[PDB]
Amino acid sequence: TDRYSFSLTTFSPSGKLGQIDYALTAVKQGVTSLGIKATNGVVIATEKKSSSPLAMSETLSKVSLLTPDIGAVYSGMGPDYRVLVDKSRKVAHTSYKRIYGEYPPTKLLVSEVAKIMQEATQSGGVRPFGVSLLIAGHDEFNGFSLYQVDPSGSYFPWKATAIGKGSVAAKTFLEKRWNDELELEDAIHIALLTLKESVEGEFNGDTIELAIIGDENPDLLGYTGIPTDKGPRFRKLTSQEINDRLEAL
Template sequence: MTGSIADARASVDRARGEAAEFRYKFGYEMPCDVLAKRLANINQVYTQRAYMRPLGVATTLISVDDELGPQLYKCDPAGYYVGYKATASGPKQQEALNHLEKKLKNKDCAPGDWEEVVELGISTLSTVLSVDFKKGELEVGIVGGPQSDGKDGSDPAFKTLTEEQIDERLQAISERD
């Protein structure tokens, strides 16, 4: 979420309610594209009604679908939503999008395993903001990383990286450069 904190809370509550209602009605989790379309429709109604204040928040939705794989959608306050391979929100959004577009040109997705994708995200932030990050200055969340119990395969659950794991990625970036 990028924008007003109060509007972000209202939007998240609405999205949770929509997803819960969908699951209750149909018996399976709401696909990311369906939720993005629903939120965009709600945002669009808010922009047209004179007695309603438009929500000042851009929403980024991420999911891993059983059939379609990873999905990334972004909804803006005007009711426009679109799917992406990679996206950014907030200040310096266009610079980040240009950097990601340059790195991912003619590719279906970011190449490599989860470690390389995290390194791409960190290096994009570092380049756009002209800052060298330290391990305590970043928070990174991933889906599809290594199993926490050490078994083979990827973990489908969302988890945040520890400071040590972030430091390993920062070291790999500095060694590569």
């Protein structure tokens, strides 16, 4: 069985933990992903890639819904993203939703996912997660809000940011295109456009996944007749929709 009860994340002699740095290496191999926080939405975009063209990417989720207000997008390992999306869903409901009756604020859920990162540097027999997530979301008290969770286990709030293999180019392009006021239609127009200087394969709506956490929908709620509840502010855009807006760049 088990017979490991000692960490394999250890400090180096000149300081700095060796393992949390290596794990951050595996992230910059992966795909390029971005998130731009506007005044009325957050838009996130990522690029979809497959083993082969016989593999579908329409049955693979590189954007996930954690709660009806807070979505996720990654650059890094697919497998690590999978488990870390599920454990977040489970802790979102069990360590706040039952007790407080509503879904967690964006900040509050971010804070929780950061301790899971922490327990894979700390505790024996485990190695760190190898994804950096952007967790974009909306809560009633921080407005719209963008965070970047990393393998280190620390998070930083952003105004717009990039992670992946194109990260350095992306953020130099994003510096010049972030404006104080950004409308939701303008925000989509920067995010597709940034991702396009970080694509060298196919460019189609079936290879570019885009999701808005715009403003609310009373048409994906599944019911009507309670005016308290206003549906998902998260709304992933199908391939066709994204594709119209590629022809309008």
